Design a protein around this ligand. Structure first.
Ligand SMILES: Fc1cccc(CNCc2ccco2)c1
Ligand SMILES: Fc1cccc(CNCc2ccco2)c1
Lengths: 304, 304
């Protein structure tokens, strides 16, 4: 029993983190096989960042201009290319600690773990979701860029995120490991405003299931609803619409608890209309939306 | 910017986790040098657990009765002793992945990271505090016993906790790595009730500082107070008393933000008397007490 905001163990990712320096700019890189992946803005002076032309800035750079340090030992860069907003530095040594891995582009509402690093050294690990506006609410200081988001399936690290930007509102933007930004963001120090940070409805529902499973039941009501009825209320409350895809995914939690998905939807609806009345669920005073259905099953069944 | 509930990277601890089996009972052990530490109740049948005599149960056990598996390779047990509520199994191989480490007995309100494991395999990592009633609010299923709590200072893992018990109320009890329980708990399946789960006042104050630092300022008021005045209100609200020791420790956050500790105390006092009025601080609807002053400095300054 107990339910916790739980990150994947970070060991497999700690073994991939390096320091990348280009001139006076230092940030984190990900060393997988003989490639080091890092934010392309490593090549910019914070002056460059105001309106950088990366292709033109890159012309000025050679393999030897990129310093890669893994522990306190330098790696030899024998090639570099830009892919979208990341640099791929070919090093002469394949990473001894390279885990099995994939690069995956996740969907808004998907959760992942961040290993926050500075100078290629890990400082901490936390659990995140991709917000529906394709931002994340991270904890990231200067030097944290190139810190990565991941999921683990048994022994295979799926890398989904690389940290690039803090927006003026202090939320975070970054790329998949092919250098494609989540959302409409660009690696430039310019006014960029996020869209509406809606609640991930399917995740709240999963966490309501986690709560029932763990004995927090006070909020279970005598009502059910429909997807259409619920989705009218959702809209009003800046909740994401719920689809039959979300209902399908909640099936196993529905089955384990014997609470039909639409009944839990009606429980949620009343929580939205009534608020918590100073009560808590799993020691939270608001509805938590940073557990997926898969997260709740995993934690509640004890997957390793 | 951003503030996150952040665990230490778990890599150094992942490399210490083994499976310990004694008869039909399997749980996690910690392999440091040539010793495997695990809960002594590894020797019990859930029948034994109702009123176990560990010394008498141990007489029946030899070195060879303890099966230790690290990855999928067996370690040879060449000795065993009981120290308080842990078994120390001497193995013939020192752990290649042994980090620099210490065993430390932490104080209530101290935070640490848990690497939740099953069959000596890590499933997740989360950040905890030792509650003032010497329980923790973990996430722990059957097979999680021997999972450990730790802090890291640069390259040195301080092990402070080993998981033993879930109380009937679903909160968790365990030992330091010398097998001494936190609080008045015993490794026995018997009615054991926790005392009052008070709020860690100094930690709430630290997190109020973290909030000011990150731009959440709405709650800052026009009042100050005294330790005595504040401690009257604290008492009423099941907050731990604040000492000059807590004030000393908050000094650096006070200095960085220019908010005197007693002014922040008066801010807290009003939050207690008024509640949040449906507002949030660092995206929380209640006051967070699972960041220490040292946690807030570390995260806000970016230590690795
Ligand atoms: F040069 C290499 C290139 C790719 C893989 C490897 C071996 N990686 C083993 C491993 C997994 C986790 C920690 O170490 C070495
Ligand atoms: F047999 C041994 C006994 C004690 C220590 C060691 C070496 N430990 C090195 C290390 C640190 C982190 C990962 O590996 C080996």
């Amino acid at each position: 029993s107990g339910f916790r905001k739980m990150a994947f163990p970070s060991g497999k990712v700690e073994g991939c983190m390096v320091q990348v320096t280009c001139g006076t700019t230092t940030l984190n890189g990900l060393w997988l096989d003989d490639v080091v992946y890092c934010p392309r803005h490593v090549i910019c002076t914070s002056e460059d960042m105001l309106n950088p032309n990366y292709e033109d800035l890159l012309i000025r750079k050679s393999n030897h201009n990129f310093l890669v340090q893994a522990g306190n030992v330098q790696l030899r860069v024998i090639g570099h290319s830009m892919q979208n907003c990341v640099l791929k530095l070919k090093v002469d040594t394949a990473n001894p600690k390279t885990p099995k891995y994939k690069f995956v582009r996740i969907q808004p509402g998907q959760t992942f773990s961040v290993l926050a690093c500075y100078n290629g050294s890990p400082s901490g690990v936390y659990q995140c979701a991709m917000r529906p506006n394709f931002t994340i609410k991270g904890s990231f200081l200067n030097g944290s860029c190139g810190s990565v988001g991941f999921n683990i399936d048994y022994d295979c690290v799926s890398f989904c995120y690389m940290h690039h930007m803090e927006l003026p509102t202090g939320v975070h933007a970054g790329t998949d490991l092919e250098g494609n930004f989540y959302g409409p963001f660009v690696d430039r120090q310019t006014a960029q405003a996020a869209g509406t940070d809606t609640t991930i409805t399917v995740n709240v529902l999963a966490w309501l299931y986690a709560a029932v499973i763990n004995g927090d039941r006070w909020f279970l009501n005598r009502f059910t609803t429909t997807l259409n009825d619920f989705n009218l209320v959702a809209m009003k409350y800046n909740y994401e619409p719920l689809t039959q895809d979300h209902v399908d995914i909640l099936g196993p939690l529905s089955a384990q608890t014997g609470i039909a998905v639409l009944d839990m939807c009606a429980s949620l609806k009343e929580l939205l209309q009534n608020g918590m009345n100073g009560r808590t669920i799993l020691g939270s005073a608001l509805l938590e939306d940073e557990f997926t259905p898969f997260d709740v099953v995993r934690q509640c069944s004890g997957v390793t």
